[PDB]
Amino acid sequence: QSYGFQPTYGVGYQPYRVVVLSFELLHAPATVCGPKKSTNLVKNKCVNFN
Amino acid sequence: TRFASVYAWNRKRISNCVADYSVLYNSASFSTFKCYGVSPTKLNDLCFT
Amino acid sequence: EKSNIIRGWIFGTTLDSKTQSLLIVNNATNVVIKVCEFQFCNDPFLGVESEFRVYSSANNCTFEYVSQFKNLREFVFKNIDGYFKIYSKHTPQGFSALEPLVDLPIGINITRFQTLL
Amino acid sequence: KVGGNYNYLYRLFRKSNLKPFERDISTEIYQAGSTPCNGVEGFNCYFPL
Ligand SMILES: *[C@@H]1O[C@H](CO)[C@@H](O[C@@H]2O[C@H](CO)[C@@H](O)[C@H](O)[C@H]2NC(C)=O)[C@H](O)[C@H]1NC(C)=O
Ligand SMILES: *[C@@H]1O[C@H](CO)[C@@H](O)[C@H](O)[C@H]1NC(C)=O
Ligand SMILES: *[C@@H]1O[C@H](CO)[C@@H](O)[C@H](O)[C@H]1NC(C)=O
């Protein structure tokens, strides 16, 4: 059955866009990640590096 | 803006790329934003298939 | 073979439109690597310029990759730890070492291969 | 059956791991009052109670 949508309808009946994102658990090589960090480089003093 | 109906909900598969979640939880255009299982911030420190 | 009669490969598990498959098929400009459900009927024909008959239908795509005396074009294929690895060299006695080219994170099983030719 | 009424209450407060044997009696509405809460002050202000 078709929705009836009009700009004068109630807020409860107003349209709403819902996006559900689902990520599967770890069972394969990981291909989606995010940015981690970046930092300027220094020299001639012993520091911790990654 | 063109979205499918609830009965004909479309599926978009995203993989093999870098995901930027910082825009998602820092945008005021979303009235409802809730994550089940994992905290939204820590999602920027994990990887999935 | 000092020509392009042999160009690419067909590769994967038992090809019956099930499980998965691998192309690793290249056309000079693009080394296109798709792992879609390519329905291979009976034809590993080279696409020459007329058309490309290697596949009948493509159901579910999952991966895509794009990149760039005689000569001995030599290759080595491995699949281990869920990674597909290819090594190659261009220039039978003598000793030479092989250098990595790509590292595909696919992880699918493979038990069969064919040459286009 | 006729018992708990706004007295036996838990805390969903986060971003501050408490040391062992500590009393977290901060009965305050949780808000950052800065950028990391909807980008303005007063929003995402939920009391973790
Ligand atoms: C080689 O095959 C590819 C894939 O069929 C052809 O398409 C190229 O690659 C992708 C499509 O998968 C797109 O970027 C373009 O359609 C093409 N890109 C470029 C840079 O050509 C491609 O045209 C084929 N090349 C030849 C010479 O036949
Ligand atoms: C393609 O993937 C969908 C995902 O649900 C599945 O239902 C379908 O059977 C798959 N088709 C083939 C040919 O594997
Ligand atoms: C490879 O085969 C095993 C069993 O033979 C199966 O459990 C596994 O899922 C297969 N690999 C993939 C990537 O599906």
Contact predicate C9/C113, CB 8 Å: yes
* Residue showing tokens 């809730």: B34
* Nearest alpha-carbon partner for D34 in D18, D19, D15, D48: D15
CB contact under 8 A, A34 and B17: no
Tell me the C-alpha distance between C46 and C9, whole Å. 10
Burial-class residue D5 by CB neighbours within 10 Å (0-12, 13-18, 19+). Answer: exposed
**Any CB–CB contact under 8 A between A12 and chain B?**
no
**What residues contact A2, with CB distance under 8 A and at least 6 apart?**
none
* Residue showing tokens 């509405």: D29
| Radius of gyration of the CA atoms of chain B, in A | 13
* Residue showing tokens 């691998």: C22
* Nearest alpha-carbon partner for C79 in A29, D20, A39: A29
Tell me the C-alpha distance between B49 and B24, whole Å. 20
Q: Is C62 in the pocket of ligand 1 (CB under 6 A)?
A: no
Q: Which helix (DSSP H) or strand (DSSP E) does residue C80 occupy?
A: strand C74-80
* Residue showing tokens 């020459």: C48
Tell me the C-alpha distance between C116 and C41, whole Å. 14
Q: Tell me the one-letter amino acid at D38.
A: N
State how far the alpha carbon of C89 is from the alpha carbons of C16, C94, C117, in Å: 33, 13, 19
Say what the resolution is, in angstroms.
Answer: 3.2
Residue C95 φ/ψ, nearest 5 degrees: -120, 135
Q: How many helices (H) and strands (E) does chain B have?
A: 1, 1
**Any CB–CB contact under 8 A between B45 and chain A?**
yes
**What residues contact D36, with CB distance under 8 A and at least 6 apart?**
B26
* Nearest alpha-carbon partner for A33 in C53, B47, B40: B47
Q: Where are the beta strands (DSSP E) in chain B?
A: 17-18
Tell me the C-alpha distance between C15 and C111, whole Å. 10
- Please tell me the total number of residues recorded for chain D in this structure: 49
Q: Tell me the one-letter amino acid at B9.
A: W
Contact predicate C59/C78, CB 8 Å: no
Interface test with B, best of D17, D38, D43, D46 (most B CBs within 10 A): D38
| Radius of gyration of the CA atoms of chain A, in A | 25
CA B35, B37, C83 angle in degrees (round to 5)?
Answer: 105
Q: What are the b/e assignments for C51-82, b being 16+ CB within 10 Å?
A: eeebbeeeeeeebebeeeeeeeeeeeeebeee
Q: What is the dihedral of CA D30, D33, D35, D38, to 10 degrees?
A: 60
Contact predicate C8/C50, CB 8 Å: no
Q: Is C107 in the pocket of ligand 3 (CB under 6 A)?
A: yes
